[PDB]
Amino acid sequence: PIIDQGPLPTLTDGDKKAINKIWPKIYKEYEQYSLNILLRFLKCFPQAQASFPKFSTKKSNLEQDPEVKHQAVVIFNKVNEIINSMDNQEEIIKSLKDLSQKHKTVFKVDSIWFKELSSIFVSTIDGGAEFEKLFSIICILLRSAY
Ligand code: HEM
């Protein structure tokens, strides 16, 4: 499963190979996959919608809301960036620690949600242990500033 605290897991060559085998299929339809993931998260955890002021007052037809679609792709693109540089641990650390600080003080998001959205991200793309490890690294780092 996905964890959000403790030492960072290490992605093996095997892990990276599996991730790189599965990702292209998702990436090629990033708009709809990214949207589906966020919508699923909001359906499973309606109480999490309060964490997105840009669409927190929006009810019904979220799929057509520009703020919802944009929020979804911004999250997806960050994951895409990380996958694109799995060989550079330092870059991933630096980048995500900075983002962690922004979510804490600027976006004022409760770090408890990262793991929940990530779980839905993984199940949506039918990812396996390899992706859970990837998202564990991502969540631990996004939770680091808290
Ligand atoms: C895999 C997990 C996640 C990743 C990789 C991620 C990534 C991002 C990125 C890259 C941005 C844009 C940064 C910027 O504009 O400077 C962002 C913004 C934001 N994220 Fe996250 N995020 C994640 C999970 C969450 C969760 C769980 C919530 C809320 C429950 C959340 C709420 C927000 C909000 C409110 C913004 C600000 C949007 C805006 O004002 O334009 N994020 N996130």
Side-chain angles (χ1 to χ4, degrees):
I2 296 156
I3 61 158
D4 55 20
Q5 43 181 88
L8 289 189
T10 295
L11 289 171
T12 67
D13 284 343
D15 288 330
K16 296 185 215 190
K17 187 170 178 59
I19 285 157
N20 280 334
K21 236 106 155 273
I22 293 161
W23 197 244
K25 173 204 187 163
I26 311 299
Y27 176 82
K28 99 178 182 62
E29 293 193 69
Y30 70 92
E31 288 161 312
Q32 186 73 182
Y33 268 117
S34 67
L35 176 58
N36 282 357
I37 291 160
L38 184 58
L39 293 179
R40 270 200 78 204
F41 172 63
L42 296 171
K43 281 284 191 214
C44 290
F45 304 97
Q47 70 264 224
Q49 195 177 152
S51 297
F52 306 94
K54 295 192 172 171
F55 62 83
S56 66
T57 73
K58 224 290 163 76
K59 183 156 187 48
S60 94
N61 308 311
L62 290 201
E63 66 256 36
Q64 292 303 272
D65 191 326
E67 296 292 0
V68 173
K69 290 159 63 202
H70 196 265
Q71 180 64 77
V73 86
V74 163
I75 290 174
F76 185 98
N77 283 355
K78 189 90 259 299
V79 171
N80 178 244
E81 284 179 15
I82 297 175
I83 278 165
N84 279 177
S85 47
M86 289 186 288
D87 283 349
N88 195 150
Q89 271 160 278
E90 319 86 68
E91 229 297 71
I92 293 171
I93 304 290
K94 167 194 198 164
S95 166
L96 288 183
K97 266 166 61 239
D98 217 72
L99 192 52
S100 178
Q101 207 64 238
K102 235 200 151 143
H103 281 72
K104 180 181 180 190
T105 69
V106 187
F107 307 149
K108 295 152 100 237
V109 167
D110 194 307
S111 75
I112 193 83
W113 289 122
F114 300 132
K115 180 199 175 296
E116 299 306 337
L117 181 150
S118 291
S119 280
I120 283 155
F121 202 123
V122 175
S123 63
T124 296
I125 66 175
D126 286 310
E130 297 83 6
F131 270 94
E132 290 185 324
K133 186 186 277 198
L134 170 72
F135 272 95
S136 279
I137 293 167
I138 295 173
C139 287
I140 286 164
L141 288 167
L142 276 177
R143 246 239 214 164
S144 67
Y146 296 71

